Design an enzyme around this catalytic site. Structure first.
Site, PDB file in Angstrom:
ATOM      1  N   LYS A 220       0.801  -1.223   0.000  1.00 11.46           N
ATOM      2  CA  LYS A 220       0.000   0.000   0.000  1.00 11.46           C
ATOM      3  C   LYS A 220       0.839   1.280   0.000  1.00 11.46           C
ATOM      4  CE  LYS A 220      -0.665   0.503   4.953  1.00 11.46           C
ATOM      5  NZ  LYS A 220      -0.612  -0.940   5.481  1.00 11.46           N
TER       6      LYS A 220
ATOM      7  N   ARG B  59     -17.166   7.632  -7.922  1.00 10.40           N
ATOM      8  CA  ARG B  59     -18.310   8.422  -8.385  1.00 10.40           C
ATOM      9  C   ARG B  59     -18.208   8.882  -9.851  1.00 10.40           C
ATOM     10  NH1 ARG B  59     -18.706  11.421  -2.445  1.00 10.40           N
ATOM     11  NH2 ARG B  59     -19.981   9.787  -1.452  1.00 10.40           N
TER      12      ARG B  59
ATOM     13  N   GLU C 167       4.382   6.703   9.418  1.00  4.10           N
ATOM     14  CA  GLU C 167       5.092   5.504   9.884  1.00  4.10           C
ATOM     15  C   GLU C 167       6.593   5.572   9.646  1.00  4.10           C
ATOM     16  OE1 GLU C 167       4.424   1.621   7.994  1.00  4.10           O
ATOM     17  OE2 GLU C 167       4.454   0.649   9.982  1.00  4.10           O
TER      18      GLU C 167
ATOM     19  N   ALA D 226       4.295   1.435  -0.984  1.00  7.28           N
ATOM     20  CA  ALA D 226       4.968   1.370  -2.271  1.00  7.28           C
ATOM     21  C   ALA D 226       4.058   1.861  -3.403  1.00  7.28           C
ATOM     22  CB  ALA D 226       5.469  -0.037  -2.544  1.00  7.28           C
TER      23      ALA D 226
ATOM     24  N   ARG E 277      13.283   4.243  -1.061  1.00  3.43           N
ATOM     25  CA  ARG E 277      12.161   3.459  -1.565  1.00  3.43           C
ATOM     26  C   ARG E 277      11.577   4.014  -2.873  1.00  3.43           C
ATOM     27  NH1 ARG E 277      12.294   0.836   3.249  1.00  3.43           N
ATOM     28  NH2 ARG E 277      11.046  -1.062   3.523  1.00  3.43           N
TER      29      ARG E 277
END
Lengths: 358, 138, 358
Positions: free
Chosen positions: C169, C337, C194, C171, C203
């Site tokens: 999630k 939507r 985090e 990454a 990363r």
């Protein structure tokens, strides 16, 4: 008056609330009335919904302080009075300032008032009086390839060296202190909370003149030992080491003693013997960092716990205060802000109690 | 606690009085054109002042200044300001002053709405009211 | 007051009637006069024709309640009073609530009142007591076929991506943040509650220049890695990324920093790292939606929980505030939507930490 401006400008912009709230909390306001409003103002913002005259008057009503302020009349008074919302921030700073002043006065008045009622404490009184009022480079290590990754030990950094019991963390910090004393010309301050000040000395006397199996402890020596201590004593006799083995001391006293030594003789390193043993630790970590910053000196705080980060972290912050975190295992510099992170490898003698190069 | 435009009239004096670099900006934009007789008289004195090549400080102004203006001009020089008026601050103040005769206006048609309402001309007053909502949006 | 606002706002928008009537029926109003107006307001809308001061004052007159309210005086008063009609709904909710409370009191009082007159029943009393008490656009994602189903990421939408621990999630969000910054010309603001700010950068360094098994972590690299990072660093250097790793922050602070960045540089995306970790959540959800709406910018909130809807629903609202809910499993766009709902499949490298097209 500036209070009324902020409140007012919120009714106006009302994106005004954002900078206002970045600079104020309800408590900053002197009048309760405004406290109530500004709180309601925020409590409406936490949806929501947005924030404007009717929507606030409605939150105030809800929690029933509408008439406990002004009426809607005072809310409108505020709304209609304010000519612009390009200040707010402000205004905010003004209220925030006058808030700080009230706190100053309060915590200062609480000290005087507290002066007569204790007496009793003096030391708790003088500590919770700072506590209340507060609310290659470098320096060479001695060791060739520790210097390289770090370039010092430099001035205003807090260095935390952690290692499991009896790995050699004291014997490591002592050799650092020793090299810095005997080889440079820079006073070092050691706090040895655990071990006595004189059982510390032979541990660095042994570290030099390469003395002891014979042994200093077990009485008598050979002519080679005698002719050795004499220079070891001699060489360490001119070094800039200061020791303080005071049983277990609070931060403010490390800080006070180190402060006085800086002005009178010099100072270059504060090597505290183990943190976990000083007298929550996150609040001490914080203070050690500030100490280093105030004295423009590297502070080496030894710590007790493989290893890695979460071994010490789980027991009182430290992580975000120390700018370099060493581990004895191999010397693992696991965090440093100078640059590199990796493993430096040192040899260890034992008999002489030395850590040595490679 | 005083209506907005008045506070802007007030503060504007408080600024030009202290800074004659602001007064020069106020002059081309507002006559005045100031909305209250006192503020008008003062602005006439302020504007002049500097046109006498005159340095710049209230210590000088408040000493000028018939005497019946002094009790007011005095208590404006002490008001409360940052010295420095934000770019938009000035446009926000001037806008209030400048478009005050426009609010003093719609109360003329306000009296016409209610006078129509009294002769039971309900759809006419409605229109007048719908007209006001337009001017009011400005 | 809330009542006046609704009626007022109608005389203003008057597309303010639509949401007003979705939330209120005339009887929700406490004052009769307002009951009459809102009803008349609705009676006109039922043609027709449309709804404005005139037309309403006509209907009221026609059913002869014109003077039974205010006059046109009061109608003008509502009109001329209210400043804004971007609330209404509102306002509506306020009136609707106080309507519900009255009903509660009425049906509860009628139970007490009914407690003496029957006696007799007990069982009709107790049963009719429950009975009574129960009543492409956009901002490109980088990823060809995600874009199609969504067409962006567009401005004012709150996009929540949820996935179980270690499915990717973070990454995933990062790569979005990255493609937007490197490929468009639009600043992105990342809150990474985090993981640390610099642990994050590799990363997405790794997720470029296709770097790492060698590894950046484990010290030394090849002349192939070195000559690679240099471009990766170079290309990411000019990107519009803004990171904030502040431990765990309240929403008012996300909203404040993002507001400043909009006026000084730009802003296109806010990517919050995980919601369950910001500092009931239904009150945070609401706020994030309102943050996206204010800044005309898509807010990507990551979340922690097969999967499907009730997996995050049971832990605080979100469902009705988020207008697009994505799952990582397969990228399951479970609610949106713009239009379509269904699965888009994405490849995942790992070594390079990249999500890639197919």
């Amino acid at each position: 008056e500036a209070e009324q401006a902020v409140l007012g400008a919120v009714f106006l912009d009302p994106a005004a609330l954002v900078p206002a709230s970045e600079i104020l909390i309800p408590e900053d306001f002197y009048r309760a009335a405004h406290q109530k409003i500004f709180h309601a103002m925020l409590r409406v913002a936490d949806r929501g919904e947005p924030v404007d005259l009717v929507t606030v008057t409605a939150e105030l009503a809800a929690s029933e302080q509408l008439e406990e302020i002004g009426g809607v009349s005072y809310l409108s008074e505020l709304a209609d009075a304010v000519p612009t919302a390009a200040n707010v921030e402000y205004y905010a700073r003004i209220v925030e300032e006058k808030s700080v002043l009230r706190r100053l006065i309060r915590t200062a008045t609480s000290i005087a008032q507290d002066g007569y009622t204790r007496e009793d404490e003096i030391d708790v009184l003088l500590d919770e009086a700072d506590r209340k009022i507060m609310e290659i480079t470098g320096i060479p290590t001695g060791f060739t390839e520790l210097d390289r990754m770090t370039s010092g030990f430099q001035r205003s950094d807090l260095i935390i060296v952690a290692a499991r019991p009896s790995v050699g963390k004291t014997a490591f910090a002592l050799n650092i202190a020793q090299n810095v004393a005997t080889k440079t010309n820079e006073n070092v301050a050691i706090f040895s909370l655990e071990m006595s000040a004189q059982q510390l000395v032979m541990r660095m006397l042994c570290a030099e003149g390469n003395i002891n199996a014979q042994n200093l402890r077990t009485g008598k020596l050979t002519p080679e030992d005698w002719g050795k201590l004499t220079m070891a004593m001699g060489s360490l006799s001119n070094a800039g080491i200061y020791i303080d083995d005071t049983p277990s001391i609070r931060v403010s006293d490390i800080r006070a003693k180190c402060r006085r030594l800086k002005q009178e003789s010099g100072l270059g390193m504060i090597v505290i013997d183990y943190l976990q043993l000083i007298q929550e630790v996150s609040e001490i970590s914080r203070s050690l960092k500030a100490l280093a910053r105030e004295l423009e000196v590297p502070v080496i705080a030894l710590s007790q716990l493989r290893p890695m980060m979460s071994d010490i972290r789980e027991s009182g912050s430290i992580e975000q205060d120390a700018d370099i975190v060493a581990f004895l295992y191999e010397i693992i510099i696991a965090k440093q802000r100078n640059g590199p992170v990796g493993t430096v490898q040192l040899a260890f003698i034992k008999e002489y109690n030395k850590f040595v190069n490679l | 606690l005083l209506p907005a435009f008045q506070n802007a009239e007030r503060l504007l004096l408080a600024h030009m009085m202290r800074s004659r670099d602001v007064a020069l900006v106020v002059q081309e934009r507002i006559g005045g054109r100031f909305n209250i007789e006192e503020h008008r008289a003062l602005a006439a004195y302020i504007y002049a002042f500097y046109e006498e090549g005159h340095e710049a400080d209230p210590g000088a102004l408040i000493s000028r200044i018939p005497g019946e203006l002094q009790p007011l001009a005095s208590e404006l020089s002490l008001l409360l300001i940052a010295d420095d008026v934000s770019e938009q601050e000035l446009e926000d103040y001037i806008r209030h002053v400048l478009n005050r005769p426009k609010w003093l206006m719609l109360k003329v048609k306000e009296q016409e709405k209610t006078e129509a309402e009294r002769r039971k001309d309900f759809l006419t007053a409605a229109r007048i009211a719908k007209e006001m909502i337009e001017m009011k949006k400005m």
